[PDB]
Design a protein around this ligand. Structure first.
Ligand code: CLA
Ligand SMILES: CC1=C(/C=C/C(C)=C/C=C/C(C)=C/C=C/C=C(C)/C=C/C=C(C)/C=C/C2=C(C)CCCC2(C)C)C(C)(C)CCC1
Ligand SMILES: CCCCCCCCO[C@@H]1O[C@H](CO)[C@@H](O)[C@H](O)[C@H]1O
Lengths: 423, 28, 101, 487, 335, 306, 37, 32, 76, 33, 65
């Protein structure tokens, strides 16, 4: 291998490979801590997070650290604590990577048979997979424990705007949890991105943690079956290709999850979603015209036209205008006004709360459908309104990363298959 | 539309199961 | 269905009781915290059930209780409810009580 | 044997068959000239030479025949609208028949020089092989070319023996075939000076005769003979291709920008005359001069000739056209049949209003009525738009001076809007669109079609120079014509 | 000295030829005298114009770094429409020998364009000279004919056909984007079959590039014919049905496709230079006008072009002195 | 042997005139269905109200349309991202009215092209060739996925996808420029550079090989070095061919990523009113002219009449 | 905003996020210094 | 603003005189 | 002809270049800073884009008499 | 080894204006605007 | 195999013959170069006149002539 493909020489150098992976993990943790500190430095805890381009602080706030009712910052210290802890753990991990890369043994096969592995060995590496699966399950159970105990998580669907609350009865029903997986990925049904309550999220993480722990123990204590050996290519680049494909799929799923979901990504921190801004604009226009004394039942007034209300293709009362494309949006400030047949005519009048109007106006001002690469504004924009939604940044970046890692699946899978075949 | 839906589901299921069996027919 | 009517009657009754106390009495405030906790529990339990969601009584109860929670969320608690908003809320409570039967 | 893009290479080594194929192409060209002249005469309409000019009917070779002097036809009519008397042998049909008879004779001569390729002339006595003395051939044919150039410039254009070239006034009102006295001064290089043509062709003929005599009496140097590969026909093919695309570029540029060799009465006006308001400025000067010596608006505008107003119209602009919009100019927007007259727009207050004329770049242009200061006093709002300065609200009234509509005033907003839309195109004219079923979209004058065709041809012949010269220089790594040298 | 069978004494020309065509790091050649000065001054003029020369007078724009422009917005803008097709010599009547006024008038654009066109001519002459020296067939110059044809048609023929140099492309990024949008709005350049053939040529050239560069690096032997031709033919016959039998034909096709596409594109640019629109389906427009319910993507494209023209001409062509009231500007609401 | 074994060996057979393969087993029905529906819809289909309002647009033949202007209209804005098969529509005419054929065609065609790339890899593996042809073909399929999908996902409706036509494609490009300013985005810039470089490299490689192919490669390399100062250039033809493939593929990958970014509203650069004088007055630039053109396109795009 | 006890370290935490690209640049510089390229 | 900044920049850009290192490979050819 | 390797290691190169390149960079800095760049190239300063009696962008309208027209438009 | 050669002329005519323009633009970056 | 002999062929034989001979050395190349430079200057002059770059008092360069 040449200089550029130099890392490819570390396929059989178990000690150096371990050191390099640990060093990259230390780099990841170092970025996490450093960017958390950077976002804490420029926070101004009197302004919404999505108006300052913060991504890590919404993640910490969703856990329920330093937040109150309506997504108000009680205190900023927990974010600084998290940044410091990730930073110091990153320093430790970097020292470990430096040691195991150079000072430590170059190959672990002979001195430490427990830590020695060969890519062709189908049992030791399955044990490694079991160990790290157990670690992932422990992390999921840690999240679940933080949910039910040791404080709560920020439920945005709580009445009055949403707040931090303790999940007491997570949805542990198998049918409800596993119906998301078979749910179609299209309009209305958003696969796993359509989860709308925190109970389902906590129950699903319970299920995935238990399954991961059980599968880790199983793969630890069971050799692969002969059909499994026959059906797969067993080489390091093949495992790399499998990981790349899976992680690219996860990247695409994360992109869609951040773009469309507002439950696991509260709108008070990440800003309104795509459909949310348009629905908020329609709601604000409707409430303004209703205050001015207009007939909101007949949209702008003609029954044959739809600007404030319209019949859905299936026969539901939905907002008029272009917002007909976003009639599947569900929001904490809009659900109380929605009856069985979509929006309720009676509930649309004399039932709109002031906080709902404030949230609708705020989300209308900051539309993710307006963004011009750190300059903001809707469509053709000149200046001002410097708002690019963090949802847009997350979606674009992780979509690009997922596509690149799918390309990695293609490249490494082809190379591994050719090498195994002998080409 | 019921008959059309059943026909389309049958065709798709047949093709998908044939494809799965093809990758399960002596192909590593 | 699924003993929803019992919890609905309980929450309606405690809402009426909480609204029935005098403003200066601290038991009013203690009942406000208790009612807020009950509201959060009830909405968390029953907003995720489509079978319950189909009932119009659930819609009326959700609208009234979310209006009350929004009132207590900002410029509320020790601030008296506006007359028109309170009347609409009580009308929703009465509709729910009638429609449960 | 040879591929489809190499078959005509079979005559590269046979001077007789080369002469035969060149004769065949020449016969085809002359036959096309005759056939096109006959067809255009058969489709031409000489009834109205003012509002239905020869460049509005799509005539292509009639402009050239009239340019060098052919103005009469055997049908009893002339290009000037008069009645022909004793048209003579040299009419449009006469020239067509002449080129056709020449085509037939050249076809027969091509057949003869083809069936008898093997001639003792083509073989040099030194080697007894088919060889052409390219420098001497070039000298002889260039001497002939220069003699013909001098004869044409001194006897035809000058009018000593020939009829003379077509000369017209600057605005294309009184144009006819007249002899021109050669102008040897600096104004002889004025491209709009007709005498420059005669002076140039005379001087170039004399210089060409001298150059032919020299290149015929003086052999080339060995260094130039090797450097230019003078022993191969492919070299002279490449150089001829270069010369012809240079000439095509020059002639297309002159046709597009206009010159004394492309009168506007024959090929139509240019787009730069409309861009700069040439005819508009002339008409305004004429009407101001008429108004200075008393008179009236109606009299002053009726004193303007119809042809001059016709030139001031965007329909005659060659730029306004389409690549696939085939046919004559009359085939789209109809045949002109009369001039309505100048339309003066005045608002309800009394201020005169002027319509912002449509530039050439805009297929559709907003209708804006400006004042003398350039402020937008009125406009036609976009389709079903809120009106704030619409002609209905402003109250614009249009009065017509001269032409068919003289002294008529219209205050109806529909008619005023229609006339404003027609006036943003320039002078308002009446067209009939039922005789030819005109589609109402603008076609291009023969000026534009000629410019497009010959510019594309020059661009392709640039690649011709490149390719055939690449074969010339790199004959060693290629295959083809042989070469010979001596002394 | 011994040219041909005979021989002549060496002269100054022979010494100059020996000095120019000798082997060194930078091959000068006879064509170098035309290439290096012209290309060097074209690049220098472009850099100087994008760095110091302004366009506040020619176009009423800031197009230089000291005016606050970055790499994307900086450009060497064309002169004003008033000068029409003036060549704008620094010693000419417009500049009167004043370098500052010459730069202000926009003559640097003409300087760059003309010296760069002569640089392109010298570059293809250099290609011919080097091919002759190495004794190779000069297909590279034939391929390079297409870029020169495009440059001549766009930067020279089009402004000459139009009112003046003002409508030629300005040497810049945002300027060339404006030029592209200008042809979109005023000429409907997408619907022209010649840019259609150019699009087909470029996309096919990219396709052939990728296909060839994958087939090679996918067919090299396990260890000029470093790749297996038989396996490539079998692969491209079992998939897609048709495969290129021989290497010579495939490489000739890769030569031919982009060059002919670009040549057709240049012909279309000439057609635009004479303002000759193409593919104007007037029947669609008549049907849409008489029937408001009828609508097609062609009519929507026509409306978009009208909007582009009306909303761009106010500032794109300052010489017309045209101001549009808000009521006359086309909008979708009014339609 | 058994019928199943015979069918399997026929499918995997490389001796057929056209290779089918297991990926092709899924590919062929999808591609044939998409082709049939596209032909039927293009030839004769009722007008589709793409905007969702009751103002249909006719893009099919037999309805006053030709090949150049003809297209398959994207589904109605009312449907949005909803899955709209035939059986979910009230009636066949109502299905055609809302633009269902576009969704059917795009879904079956995307499945077809994915299975086509899979089949390309499958044949490359069966023949023993290196499997970099599939990763090269991954770029056009990525662009197709970003154009026909992803972008409707980001915008929230399939009506924003590119129509299956010529004039429809031009309209889609113009509207995309109006809404996102794709020209100033660095990734359409990278795609333009990629395709221009692909054409340039294809032309030069063809010319060099055709000149060298007589009746030397080192002579061609020397000529290239003398022409432009790349005497070193690549180590051999291996690096040359790999770079030849990599340039356009990387360009198309980057332009697909860019279109995805604009799908999630991350638009390109905008320098409107980025230059001011001392007094604060705005000094125009070329980007301002581009902004004016975008304004015209956007105002004429907004059919806010119903 | 950082706590007042850690206020003076504002430039340090401003520079910290960019450090990983400095690591990759350092890796490139190390590769060039040993001069395999 | 300060000319001392210009001196710092000239000192920094002086070591960019390693341009021959860029082209030495291009001059590493034999060509004979 | 001389290889690029030895020039990189030579006292003469690293002295003449070390004394000339900073001088050139300072020359460019002073050319920009002293305002000479505005004067020689005619680029208006940020405080003189809109001179008195011209509150809009300039426009050359006469081809032949463009010298004094540009001089007048530039505020003399 | 001539002091002035074609390579020397080319490299100097490319670098000297490049250095001058780089210094210019570096000064340009710090204009108060 | 001698070709056909015709009276016109014999008449024109001296012209086609004499083929291939050259003057030794550069011959009259310098005179040709001088004439080429003069023609280039003339072309530049007429191009400038027709482009209005060269404005002569005697010439008008407009349609009004
Ligand atoms: C996350 C980034 C990362 C990490 C963690 C590593 C980690 C490692 N690299 Mg690596 N590398 C990287 C990026 C990275 N690299 C990049 C981007 C390139 C391209 C420029 C390279 C090119 C490269 C080469 C060429 C080599 C390494 C080698 C190594 C290993 C030995 C450490 C070393 O080089 O010192 C020095 C090791 C010595 C033996 C010298 C003794 C002193 C080590 C585990 C080396 C190796 O172990 O090869 C097997 C090796 O030769 N890398
Ligand atoms: C005009 C004119 C003149 C002059 C000319 C010239 C020749 C000039 C020069 C010019 C020049 C010659 C300049 C220079 C320039 C350069 C520059 C300005 C630089 C640039 C660079 C950069 C910008 C960087 C980039 C980079 C790299 C490469 C790496 C990575 C990163 C980056 C990308 C950043 C004369 C005398 C004729 C006279 C007349 C007028
Ligand atoms: C290829 C040649 C590129 C030359 C350098 C491009 C970068 C120019 O730099 C530009 O200088 C201006 C000075 O005010 C700044 O305003 C801009 O922000 C900056 O991008």
């Amino acid at each position: 291998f040449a200089w550029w493909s130099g890392n490819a020489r570390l396929i059989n150098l178990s000690g150096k490979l371990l050191g390099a992976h640990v060093a990259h993990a230390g780099l990841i943790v170092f970025w996490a801590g450093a960017m958390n500190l950077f976002e804490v430095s420029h926070f101004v805890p009197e302004k919404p997070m999505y108006e300052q381009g913060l991504i890590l602080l919404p993640h910490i706030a969703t856990l329920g650290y330093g937040v109150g009712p309506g997504g108000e910052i009680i205190d900023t210290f927990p974010y600084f604590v998290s940044g410091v802890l990730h930073l110091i753990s990153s320093a430790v991990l970097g020292f470990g990577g430096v040691y195991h890369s150079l000072i430590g043994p170059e190959t672990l096969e002979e001195s430490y048979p427990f830590f020695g592995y060969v890519w062709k060995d189908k049992n030791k590496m399955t044990n490694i997979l079991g160990y790290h699966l157990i670690m992932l399950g422990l992390g999921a159970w840690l999240l679940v424990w933080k949910a039910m105990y040791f404080g709560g998580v920020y439920d945005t669907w709580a009445p009055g705007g949403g707040d931090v609350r303790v999940i007491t009865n997570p949805t542990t029903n198998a049918a409800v949890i596993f119906g998301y997986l078979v749910k179609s990925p299209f309009g209305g049904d958003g696969w796993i991105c359509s989860v709308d309550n925190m109970e389902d999220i906590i129950g699903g993480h319970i299920w995935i943690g238990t399954l991961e722990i059980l599968g880790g123990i199983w793969h630890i204590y069971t050799t692969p079956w002969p059909w499994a050996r026959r059906a797969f290519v067993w080489s390091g680049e093949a495992y790399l290709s499998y990981s790349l494909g899976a992680i690219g799929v996860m990247g695409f799923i994360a992109c869609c999850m951040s773009w469309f979901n507002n439950t696991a990504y509260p709108s008070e921190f990440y800003g309104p979603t795509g459909p949310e801004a348009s629905q908020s604009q329609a709601f604000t226009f409707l409430v303004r015209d209703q205050r001015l004394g207009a007939n909101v039942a007949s949209a702008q007034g003609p029954t044959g036209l739809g600007k404030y209300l319209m019949r859905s293709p299936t026969g539901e009362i939905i907002f008029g205008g272009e917002t007909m494309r976003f009639w599947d949006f569900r929001g904490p400030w809009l659900e109380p006004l929605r009856g069985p047949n979509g929006l309720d005519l009676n509930k649309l009048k004399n039932d709109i709360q002031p906080w709902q109007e404030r949230r609708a106006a705020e989300y209308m001002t900051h539309a993710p459908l307006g963004s011009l690469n750190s300059v903001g504004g809707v469509a053709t924009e000149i200046n001002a309104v410097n708002f690019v939604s963090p949802r847009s940044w997350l979606a674009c970046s992780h979509f690009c990363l997922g596509f690149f890692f799918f390309i990695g699946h293609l490249w490494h899978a082809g190379r591994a298959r050719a090498a195994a075949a002998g080409f | 539309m019921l008959t059309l839906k059943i026909f389309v589901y049958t065709v798709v299921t047949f093709f998908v199961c044939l494809f799965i069996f093809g990758f399960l027919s002596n192909d590593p | 269905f699924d003993t929803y009517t019992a919890e609905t009657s309980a929450i309606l009754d405690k809402v009426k009781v909480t609204l029935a106390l005098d403003k200066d009495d601290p038991a009013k405030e203690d009942s406000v915290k208790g009612l807020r906790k009950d509201i959060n529990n009830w909405v968390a339990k029953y907003r995720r059930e489509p079978k319950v969601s189909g009932k119009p009584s659930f819609g009326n109860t959700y609208s009234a209780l979310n209006a009350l929670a929004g009132h207590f969320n900002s410029f509320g608690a020790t601030a008296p409810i506006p007359k028109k908003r309170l009347e609409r809320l009580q009308k929703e409570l009465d509709d729910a009580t009638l429609l449960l039967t | 044997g040879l591929p489809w893009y190499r078959v005509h290479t079979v005559v590269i080594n046979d001077p007789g068959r080369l002469i035969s194929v060149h004769l065949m192409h020449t016969a085809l060209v002359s036959g096309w000239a005759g056939s096109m002249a006959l067809f255009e005469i058969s489709v031409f309409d000489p009834s109205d030479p003012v509002l239905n000019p020869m460049w509005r009917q799509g005539m292509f070779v009639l402009p050239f025949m009239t340019r060098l002097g052919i103005t009469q036809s055997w049908g009893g009519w002339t290009i000037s609208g008069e009645t022909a008397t004793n048209p003579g042998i040299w009419s449009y049909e006469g020239v067509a028949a002449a080129h056709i008879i020449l085509s037939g004779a050249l076809f027969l001569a091509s057949v003869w020089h083809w069936t008898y390729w093997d001639l003792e002339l083509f073989r040099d006595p030194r080697t007894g092989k088919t060889a052409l003395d390219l420098p001497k051939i070039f000298g002889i044919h260039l001497f002939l070319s220069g003699l013909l150039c001098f004869g044409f410039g001194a006897f035809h254009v000058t009018g000593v023996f020939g009829p003379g070239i077509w000369v017209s006034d600057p605005y294309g009102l009184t144009g006819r075939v007249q002899p021109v006295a050669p102008s040897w001064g600096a104004d002889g290089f004025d491209p709009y000076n007709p005498g420059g043509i005669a002076s140039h062709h005379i001087a170039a003929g004399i210089l060409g005769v001298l150059a032919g005599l020299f290149h015929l009496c003086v052999r080339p140097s060995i260094r130039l003979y090797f450097g230019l590969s003078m022993g191969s026909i492919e070299t002279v093919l490449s150089s001829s291709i270069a010369a012809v695309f240079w000439a095509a570029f020059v002639v297309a540029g002159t046709m597009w920008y206009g010159s004394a060799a492309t009168p506007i009465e024959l090929f139509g006006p240019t787009r730069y005359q409309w861009d700069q308001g040439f005819f508009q400025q002339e008409i305004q000067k004429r009407v101001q001069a008429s108004l200075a010596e008393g008179a009236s608006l109606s009299d002053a505008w009726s004193r303007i000739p119809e042809k001059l107003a016709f030139y001031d119209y965007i329909g005659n602009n060659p730029a306004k056209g389409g690549l696939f919009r085939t046919g004559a100019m009359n085939s789209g927007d109809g045949i002109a049949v009369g001039w309505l007259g100048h339309a003066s727009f005045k608002d309800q207050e009394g201020r005169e209003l002027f319509v912002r004329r449509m530039p050439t770049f805009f297929e559709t242009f907003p209708v804006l009525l400006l004042d003398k200061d350039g402020i937008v006093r009125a406009d036609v709002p976009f389709r079903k738009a809120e009106s704030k300065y619409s002609i209905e609200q402003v109250g614009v009234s249009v009065t017509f001076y001269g032409g068919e509509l003289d002294g008529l005033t219209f205050t109806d907003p529909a008619t005023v809007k229609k006339y404003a839309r027609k006036a943003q195109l320039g002078e308002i004219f009446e067209f009939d669109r039922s005789t030819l079923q005109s589609d109402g979209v603008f076609r291009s004058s023969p000026r534009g079609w000629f410019t497009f065709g010959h510019v594309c041809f020059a661009l392709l012949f640039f690649f011709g120079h490149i390719w055939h010269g690449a074969r010339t220089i790199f004959r060693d790594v290629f295959a083809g014509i042989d070469d010979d040298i001596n002394d | 000295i011994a040219i041909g069978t005979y021989q002549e004494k060496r002269t100054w020309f022979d010494d100059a030829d020996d000095w120019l065509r000798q082997d060194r790091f930078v091959f000068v050649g006879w064509s170098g005298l035309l290439l290096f000065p012209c290309a060097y001054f074209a690049l220098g003029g472009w850099l100087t114009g994008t760095t110091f020369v302004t366009s506040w007078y020619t176009h009423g724009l800031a197009t230089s770094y000291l005016e606050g422009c970055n790499f994307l917005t900086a450009a060497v803008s064309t002169p004003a429409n008033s000068m029409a097709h003036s060549l704008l010599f620094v010693w000419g009547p417009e500049a009167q020998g004043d370098f500052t006024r010459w730069c202000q008038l926009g003559g640097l654009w003409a300087f760059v364009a003309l010296h760069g066109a002569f640089g392109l001519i010298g570059f293809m002459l250099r290609q011919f000279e080097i091919a002759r020296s190495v004794n190779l067939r000069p297909y590279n110059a034939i391929a390079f004919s297409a870029p020169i044809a495009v440059f001549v048609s766009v930067f020279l023929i089009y402004p000459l056909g139009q009112s003046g140099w003002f409508f030629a492309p300005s040497f810049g990024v945002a300027a060339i984007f404006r030029f592209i949008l200008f042809f979109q709005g005023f000429h409907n350049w997408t619907l022209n079959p010649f840019h259609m053939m150019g699009v087909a040529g470029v996309l096919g050239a990219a396709l052939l590039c990728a296909i060839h560069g994958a087939t090679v690096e996918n067919t090299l032997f396990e260890d000029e014919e470093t790749y297996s031709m038989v396996t490539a033919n079998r692969f491209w016959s079992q998939i897609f049905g048709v495969a290129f039998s021989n290497k010579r034909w495939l490489h000739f096709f890769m030569l031919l496709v982009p060059v002919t596409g670009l040549w057709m594109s240049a012909i279309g640019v000439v057609g635009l230079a004479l303002n000759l629109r193409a593919y104007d389906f007037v029947s669609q427009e008549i049907r849409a006008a008489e029937d408001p319910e009828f609508e097609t993507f062609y009519t929507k494209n026509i409306l978009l072009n009208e909007g582009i023209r009306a909303w761009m001409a106010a500032q794109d062509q300052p010489h017309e002195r045209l101001v549009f009231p808000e009521e006359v500007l086309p909008r979708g609401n009014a339609l | 042997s058994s019928l199943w074994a015979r069918f399997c060996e026929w499918i995997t057979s490389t001796e057929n005139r056209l290779y089918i393969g297991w990926f092709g087993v899924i590919m062929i029905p999808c591609l044939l269905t998409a082709t049939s529906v596209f032909i039927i819809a293009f030839i004769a289909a009722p007008p589709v109200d793409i905007d969702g309002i009751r103002e249909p647009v006719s893009g099919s033949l037999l309805y006053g349309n030709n090949i150049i202007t003809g297209a398959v209209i994207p589904t109605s804005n009312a449907i949005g991202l909803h899955f709209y098969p035939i059986w979910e529509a009230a009636s066949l005419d109502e299905w055609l009215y809302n633009g269902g054929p576009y969704q059917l065609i795009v879904c079956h065609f995307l499945l077809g092209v994915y299975c086509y790339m899979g089949r390309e890899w499958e044949l490359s593996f069966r023949l023993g060739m290196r499997p970099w042809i599939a990763v090269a073909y991954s770029a056009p399929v990525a662009a197709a996925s970003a154009v026909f999908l992803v972008y409707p996902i980001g915008q929230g409706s399939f009506s924003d996808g590119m129509p299956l036509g010529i004039s429809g494609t031009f309209n889609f490009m113009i509207v995309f420029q109006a809404e996102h300013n794709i020209l100033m985005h660095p990734f359409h810039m990278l795609g333009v550079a990629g395709v221009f470089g692909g054409s340039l490299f294809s032309a030069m490689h063809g010319s060099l090989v055709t000149s060298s192919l007589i009746r030397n490669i080192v002579a061609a390399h020397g000529y290239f070095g003398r022409l432009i100062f790349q005497y070193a250039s690549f180590n051999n033809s291996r690096s040359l061919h790999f770079f030849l493939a990599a340039w356009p593929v990387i360009g198309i990958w980057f332009t697909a990523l860019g279109l995805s970014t604009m799908a999630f509203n991350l638009n390109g650069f905008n320098f409107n009113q980025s230059v001011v004088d001392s007094q604060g007055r705005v000094l125009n630039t070329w980007a301002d002219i581009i902004n004016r053109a975008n304004l015209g396109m956007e105002v004429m795009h907004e059919r806010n009449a119903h | 905003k950082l706590p007042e006890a850690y206020a003076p370290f504002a430039p340090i935490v401003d520079v910290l996020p960019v450090i990983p690209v400095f690591f990759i640049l350092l890796a490139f510089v190390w590769q060039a210094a040993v001069s395999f390229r | 603003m300060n000319i001392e900044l210009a001196l710092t920049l000239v000192s920094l850009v002086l070591v960019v005189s390693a341009g021959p290192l860029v082209v030495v490979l291009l001059s590493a050819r034999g060509g004979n | 002809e001389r290889p690029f390797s030895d020039i990189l290691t030579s006292i003469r190169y690293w002295v003449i270049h070390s004394i000339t390149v900073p001088a050139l960079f300072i020359a460019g800095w002073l050319f920009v800073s002293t305002g000479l760049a505005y004067d020689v190239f005619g680029t208006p300063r940020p405080n003189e884009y809109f001179t008195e009696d011209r509150q809009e962008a300039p426009l050359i309208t006469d081809r032949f008499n463009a010298l004094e027209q540009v001089k007048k438009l530039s505020g003399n | 080894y001539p002091i002035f050669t074609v390579r020397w002329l080319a490299i100097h005519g490319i670098a000297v204006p490049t250095i001058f323009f780089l210094g210019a633009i570096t000064a340009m970056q710090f204009i108060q605007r | 195999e001698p070709g056909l002999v015709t009276p016109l062929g014999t008449l024109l034989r001296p012209l086609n013959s004499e083929a291939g001979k050259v003057l030794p050395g550069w011959g009259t190349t310098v005179l040709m170069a001088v004439f080429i430079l003069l023609f280039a200057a003339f072309l530049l002059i007429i191009l400038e006149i027709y482009n209005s770059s060269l404005i002569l008092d005697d010439v008008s360069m407009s349609w009004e002539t």
